[PDB]
From a paper:
Mycobacterium tuberculosis, the causative pathogen of tuberculosis (TB), has three HigBA type II TA systems with reverse gene organization, consisting of the toxin protein HigB and labile antitoxin protein HigA. We studied the MtHigA3 type II TA system protein, a cognate antitoxin of the MtHigB3 ribonuclease toxin. MtHigA3 is predicted to be a transcriptional regulator that autoregulates the higBA3 operon by binding to the operator as an antitoxin itself or via complex formation with the toxin MtHigB3, similar to other type II TA systems. The MtHigA3 antitoxin structure is a homodimer that contains a structurally well conserved DNA-binding domain at the N-terminus and a dimerization domain at the C-terminus.
MtHigA3 bound to DNA was found to crystallize in space group C2 with the MtHigA3 homodimer and 20 bp dsDNA in the asymmetric unit. The electron-density map of the N-terminal 35 amino acids of MtHigA3 bound to DNA was missing, probably due to protease activity. The whole topology of MtHigA3 bound to DNA is similar to that of the MtHigA3 dimer. The overall structures of the MtHigA3 dimer and MtHigA3 bound to DNA are very similar (0.81 Å r.m.s.d. for 78 corresponding Cα atoms of chain A) [Fig. 4(a)]. The interactions between DNA and the MtHigA3 dimer occur mainly through HTH motifs. Interestingly, unusual bending of DNA was observed in MtHigA3 bound to DNA. The average width of the minor groove in canonical B-DNA is 6 Å, but in the structure of MtHigA3 bound to DNA, the width of the minor groove at the A-tract region (bases 9–12) located at the centre of the DNA is narrow (∼3.7 Å). The distance measured from Q64 of each monomer on the α3-helix was increased by 1.9 Å in the MtHigA3 bound to DNA compared with the MtHigA3 dimer (from 37.3 Å to 39.2 Å). The results suggest that rearrangement of the dimer structure is required for DNA binding, providing a wider space between the HTH motifs of each monomer.
Author numbering:
A (entry chain B), B (entry chain A): 36 to 113
Write the structure that this text describes.
DNA sequence: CCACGAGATATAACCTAGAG
DNA sequence: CTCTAGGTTATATCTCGTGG
């Protein structure tokens, strides 16, 4: 219900395998480890979205400001 | 509670300039454009997290999976 | 399930002006 | 007076195979 590691949520999201979350994302199993090994801060949110999407949840990017908040609603990968 | 361009949220705050953000970001006031002229999807989760901090905001990334959600928290200086 | 080697383009970056 | 847009350089993010 709070995590620093993408792999750690996949384990929380049933028996999701690294080669299955690879398969739906149209890329290698290699790429996917290099993903959850990667610094998130040095992940493009697209490449992040693509993943959480791959586990069948939707990535909600809020920019808070004391009251005025801003939800970030941008899609369309290459 | 907007949803579109980064410039939009700056604009949306006090009439802050991409100059004195750039400053609080310590990069050119060029980049800051190339940021808001960019495709979010192809931007580093921190790039944003940085921009949004600079506007006195707190970037909040959730990956919600129906009933439960996972707030992403990965913070240790580059 | 990670490294081992291999290799794109473009993200993140500069400064110096040029369009709005 | 503010942003976009030349003109350049590059570190690593994003890709891949196959084999620790």
């Amino acid at each position: 219900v709070l995590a620093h590691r993408l792999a750690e949520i996949r384990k929380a999201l049933g028996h999701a395998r690294q080669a299955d979350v690879a398969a739906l994302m149209g890329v290698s199993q290699a790429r996917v480890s290099k993903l959850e090994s990667g610094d998130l801060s040095h992940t493009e949110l697209g490449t992040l979205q693509a993943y959480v999407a791959a586990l069948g949840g939707h990535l909600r990017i809020v920019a808070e400001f004391g009251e005025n908040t801003v939800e970030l609603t941008a899609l369309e990968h290459h």
